[PDB]
Amino acid sequence: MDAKRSAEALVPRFQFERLLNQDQAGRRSALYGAIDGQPALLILERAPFPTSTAYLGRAANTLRALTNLGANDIYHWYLASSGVIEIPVEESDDEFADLKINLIYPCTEKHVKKYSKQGVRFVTETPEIYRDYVRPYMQAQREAGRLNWVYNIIEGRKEVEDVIYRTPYGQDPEEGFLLLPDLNWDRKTVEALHLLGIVERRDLWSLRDLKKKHLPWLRHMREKLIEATTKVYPTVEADQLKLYLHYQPTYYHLNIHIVHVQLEAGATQATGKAVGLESVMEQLEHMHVGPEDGDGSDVGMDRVTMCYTLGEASDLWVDVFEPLKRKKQA
Amino acid sequence: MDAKRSAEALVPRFQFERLLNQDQAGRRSALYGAIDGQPALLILERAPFPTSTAYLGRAANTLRALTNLGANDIYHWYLASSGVIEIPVEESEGTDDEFADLKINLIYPCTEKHVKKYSKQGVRFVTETPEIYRDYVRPYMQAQREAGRLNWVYNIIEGRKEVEDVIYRTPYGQDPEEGFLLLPDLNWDRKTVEALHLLGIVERRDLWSLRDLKKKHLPWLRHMREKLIEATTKVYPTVEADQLKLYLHYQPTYYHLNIHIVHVQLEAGATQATGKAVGLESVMEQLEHMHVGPEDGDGSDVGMDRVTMCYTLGEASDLWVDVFEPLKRKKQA
């Protein structure tokens, strides 16, 4: 393993310059620097704790340093440094690791931008702002071809082996769908289940397109997605799943997240990003039908004001909401 | 300093028995065991990385072990173990300290209450129709209030408790309808502005949860939204209005309306998750556009008690044990 030793030789040559970002409760730091006089990006992460009893049964008894910070009755808190614990013969001479390291070298300005801290803003999207600015932006993104990757999966030309369930392409153009594992799921831990329900029809760009006339479709899709998930993973019951939509979505083709209720909630589930599927259905169900609205078929989410988070490097913040904010402050 | 050394002697005597829970993306493990023949609960946490240049400028060059797992062009990924890095004199009160990679909490002797608190808990997603709210859940809320479970809230509202922890309030009694106070969330260190998490406890006592909100409350809601934001940005001048999110819990942990205020940069966890957190503006918009029927008059009493709400419950909670699990059991063949 010359390439393995070669890659290992890079890390001690890293010359730190500055911290780009620290996140994940402080347990991930993105460092910028240089190796051999060229830009280098080194990402430090605390590793998860081992579950081996060889580790858990020895961690408290092998510390290389331990400092009590305070105590109150039966409560005590400390800082400590891990000692060396060797991995037993039947699980590996290795020791248990406390760090994960990613090194991008040589890195570019694109990597610096990607891993630099990005501020977040909470914006207010009225029906007028959706009509005049956001919906035109969505259209341009789709016309530019940004959904090619989605369409390639829907049509069965990519990630065929990653799909865990689908209706065959073309068999059901209105209510067909496929289930894709989320990139961060190990596909083995059922209680961390996270699937993407990508619908086959192509005319719904986001929940903004949903109207009362889509309530039957929404009911059918909710049942079908839950039915398929609990069929593929039979130890999962219906009341152990949550279905939600993103707004703003990360891409402009309606897709329904399916997560196990036991999955640790992160940004993908947070208020200002995730909207429960049943919550959208109830808003359509009870939305007011005015005298000019006929039977109500076209009453829907494009009448609502939606408030949500955006990153400050996003197109929508830079081109729409920051300028609207500046124009209002003048 | 003797008590400091005494508490340090506890940790190496810990005898591991079993893992109670591992969460926070695997970086927190709650271990159950014994010390001196009595139950002990040891919680291991990965520490945040120092920002000190003395640490960051040496971490890559002092590793005590390093294994490359793979590489692809300019991408390389590894596992590693940290070496010893001493804290420089100008950053340490003591001498011969090294940067720490672990935080440890030891509860000893612990009880069954601590084991329950830190053990993994099953979760269920339930469907609360208006009928189930009427027949089962609202009576449960009422009994909780009648039992006195809100004594702690009222003690703070009335200025008998946590007077020193309130970061802002309207003086009690001055504004009975739109008065409020702001309390820091127990999990916030009260100094890191980008992790800000406040609880807005309203002065009025007749709103138990968002189920009580109706169209007639929309002016009150608009006013409270503004007032909570103005007060937060007044106390924390580096926070702008568009760097805050306001939300309600449903189910809430207690049955007196209270509005969470969080910095947009705060990392989202269970408290913000779908099935628990409901954005304040989302409730207001749901009330704004809700249908007013022919028997509803001017619509003033149309509100959230007409909606079906879906949310998560823990399997040890009263509502699961006494309401939703029995309803589920009776329905199943």
Author numbering:
A (entry chain A): 1 to 92, 96 to 333
B (entry chain B): 1 to 333
From the paper:
In the 3′ to 5′ pathway, the mRNA body is processively hydrolyzed by the 10-component cytoplasmic exosome complex (exo-10; exo-9 plus Rrp44/Dis3), followed by the removal of the cap structure of the remaining short RNA fragment by the Scavenger Decapping enzyme DcpS (Dcs1p in yeast). The apo DcpS decapping enzyme assembles into an 80-kDa symmetric homodimer that contains dimeric N- and C-terminal domains that are linked by a flexible hinge region. The enzyme possesses two bipartite active sites that are located at the interface between the N- and C-terminal domains. Upon substrate binding to the C-terminal part of one of the active sites, the N-terminal domain flips over to enclose the mRNA substrate in a well-defined pocket.
Next, we aimed at determining whether this preference in substrate usage is a conserved mechanism, and we focused on the enzymes from Chaetomium thermophilum (a thermophilic filamentous fungus) and humans. The protein crystallized in space group P1 with one dimer per asymmetric unit. The structure was determined by molecular replacement and refined to a resolution of 1.95 Å with good geometry. DcpS forms a symmetric dimer with the same overall fold as the human and mouse protein, indicating that the fold and domain orientation of the protein is conserved despite a relatively low sequence conservation. The C. thermophilum and human apo proteins show a single set of peaks (black contours), which confirms the findings from static crystal structures. Upon addition of an mRNA substrate with one nucleotide (red contours), the C. thermophilum and human enzymes undergo a transition into an asymmetric conformation, thereby forming a catalytically competent active site. On the contrary, an mRNA substrate of three nucleotides does not result in the formation of the closed conformation (blue contours). From these data, we conclude that the length sensing mechanism that we identified in the S. cerevisiae protein is conserved in the C. thermophilum and human enzymes.
